[PDB]
Symmetry: C3
Subunit: 35 residues, 3 copies
């Protein structure tokens, strides 16, 4: 598995972003890699 | 390889946790993903 | 894919280091995992 790229979906505690992106909520259920 | 999940074993500098978990020592030799 | 090990090449936003290493520029184009 790879670190998640910019603007792609991530899951805290399960599937995280490539640094320096941060996994941020974008709605009630989903998160995206932002930064 | 995947990021390490909650309460599973991690190794600093070698096998790290899924954010926002942190790899913490739990005894003399082992580390676990906590948070 | 795995997190990048100490003194190996990394790419911010694409191929990141094993914590607690940080991906730092080492010249105009390349980055390395330091820490
Ligand atoms: Ni990672
Ligand atoms: Ni981070
Ligand atoms: Ni961290
Ligand atoms: Ni992998
Ligand atoms: Ni970091």
């Amino acid at each position: 598995e790879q670190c998640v790229k910019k603007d792609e979906l991530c899951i805290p505690y399960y599937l995280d972003c490539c640094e320096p992106l941060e996994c941020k909520k974008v709605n009630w259920w989903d998160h995206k890699c932002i930064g």
